[PDB]
Design a protein around this ligand. Structure first.
Ligand SMILES: OC[C@H]1O[C@H](O[C@H]2[C@H](O)[C@@H](O)[C@@H](O)O[C@@H]2CO)[C@H](O)[C@@H](O)[C@@H]1O
Ligand SMILES: CC(=O)NCC(=O)O
Lengths: 12, 433
């Protein structure tokens, strides 16, 4: 989960 | 989040007052106050607040958002035994199963239908192709044929999918996220039809949910496209309405994306047992679902005992006919990228910012690009960390640098890496940036 929370559609 | 109370978020189009009635029954029986809220953009707000351990105890949304929530660790695995699971339809549980775990309670099955005013339009059109001429005739009497929410792609999707648009290709139980169907011939054909309606002033690019709802409920437009939740306000308006099959396009059924309204438990809630008690023992009962349904209809509920009653309603028969012509949404994390990209394409094509062909080409490109970058980012962090745990420092740091290179704002990522990496290695990494 910790790495996935760093991403969004908008970016990183 | 406060221990000893429940905070619930549900969308403002659903029966939140009815849900609050279930909450008062719960409070009567137990210690426990239940606060139902309907914040704007809750499906975006939830991951922002729950990432900090804040937010509601329970989140309601269609199931399509929930895989992304679960991937981010935001949801508790839920805990129903077999006896409880047997009370709901098996396909509903499928909708909330993610990487083998149940991650939400299913509540109800939602599909769009065509809703029409029987006094303006005793025989509604069977096809999209019929709509321009019908609009011309109604315009001569100060009416319009059709208004629906053009600002959310959920409402245009059934037309885009009719002749072959798709999100991610279904392969024998799994979705292939490398096989995206937003810019195919069928997707382009259906969006081209909608955009021609707008060009010829048979529909307005700026129509949104509240504009369309007011138009229909005031008897100004003969048709709308909406879900079961909308029927309550039409009842109040006294419009003589019917609920029926969506129009075909090129002879093919419109194919709505079907949502399972679902309730998840926040992974950070200190009230997981109370949430379970509320959901299993109070909401997912005939009385609990009735209270919500009486406020705003749910659709076809997941709970067998109550659905056996609701199937007699002709409006539910129509909802199910439309559902069967469509497809249950994926719950996969990639759904968020799909929806953002298609929302942009629909709005841009409807407004004339882009041609239909360019709008959908770009949406396809944006989805595939987002997914490629995410895939690379995650693979490079894993590989770098794996190589560091084996002492290949140089090669491990090189992979971590590739991940950082595709992150425009790497401050949070570097904080996460600083927590796991030995200080000499983190320092080495810093010098590569
Ligand atoms: O428009 C994209 C949007 O579609 C679905 O949202 C629906 C929701 O399922 C319904 O319960 C109702 O509230 O209307 C929404 C459309 O405004 C997806 O569930 C959602 O994730 C997506 O962004
Ligand atoms: C830690 C893990 O298992 N996966 C990466 C992530 O969760 O985002």
């Amino acid at each position: 989960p910790r790495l996935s929370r760093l991403l969004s559609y908008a970016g990183c | 989040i406060e221990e000893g109370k429940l905070v619930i978020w549900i969308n403002g189009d659903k029966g939140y007052n009815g849900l609050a009635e279930v909450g008062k029954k719960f409070e009567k029986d137990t210690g426990i106050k239940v606060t139902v809220e309907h914040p704007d953009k809750l499906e975006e707000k939830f991951p922002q607040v729950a990432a900090t351990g804040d937010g509601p105890d329970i989140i309601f949304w269609a199931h399509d958002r929930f895989g992304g929530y679960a991937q981010s660790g935001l949801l508790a695995e839920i805990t129903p035994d077999k006896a409880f699971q047997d009370k709901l339809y098996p396909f509903t549980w499928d909708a909330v199963r993610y990487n083998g775990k149940l991650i939400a309670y299913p509540i109800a099955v939602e599909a769009l239908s065509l809703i029409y005013n029987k006094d303006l339009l005793p025989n509604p059109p069977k096809t999209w192709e019929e709509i321009p001429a019908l609009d011309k005739e109604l315009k001569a009497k100060g009416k319009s044929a059709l208004m629906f929410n053009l600002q959310e792609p959920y409402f245009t999707w059934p037309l885009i999918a009719a002749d072959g648009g798709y999100a991610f290709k279904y392969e024998n139980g799994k979705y292939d996220i490398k096989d995206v169907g937003v810019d195919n011939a069928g997707a382009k054909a259906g969006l081209t039809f909608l955009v021609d309606l707008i060009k010829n002033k048979h529909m307005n690019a700026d129509t949104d949910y509240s504009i369309a709802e007011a138009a229909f409920n005031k008897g100004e437009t003969a048709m709308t496209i909406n879900g079961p939740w909308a029927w309550s306000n039409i009842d109040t308006s006294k419009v003589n309405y019917g609920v029926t099959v969506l129009p075909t396009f090129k002879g093919q059924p419109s194919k709505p994306f079907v949502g399972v309204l679902s309730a998840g438990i926040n992974a950070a809630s200190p009230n997981k047992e109370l949430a379970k008690e509320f959901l299993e023992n109070y909401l997912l009962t005939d009385e609990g679902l009735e209270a919500v349904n009486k406020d705003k209809p749910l659709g076809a509920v997941a709970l067998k005992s109550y659905e056996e009653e609701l199937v007699k309603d002709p409006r539910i028969a129509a909802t199910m006919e439309n559902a069967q012509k469509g497809e249950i949404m994926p719950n996969i994390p990639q759904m968020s990228a799909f929806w953002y990209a298609v929302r942009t394409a629909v709005i841009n094509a409807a407004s004339g910012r882009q041609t239909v062909d360019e709008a959908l080409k770009d949406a396809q490109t944006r989805i595939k690009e987002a997914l490629a970058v995410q895939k690379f980012f995650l693979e490079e962090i894993q590989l770098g960390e794996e190589l560091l745990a084996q002492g290949d420092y140089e090669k491990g740091v090189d992979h971590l640098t590739n991940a950082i290179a595709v992150c425009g704002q790497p401050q949070q990522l570097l904080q996460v890496l600083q927590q796991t990496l030995p200080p000499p290695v983190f320092q080495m990494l810093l010098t590569k940036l």
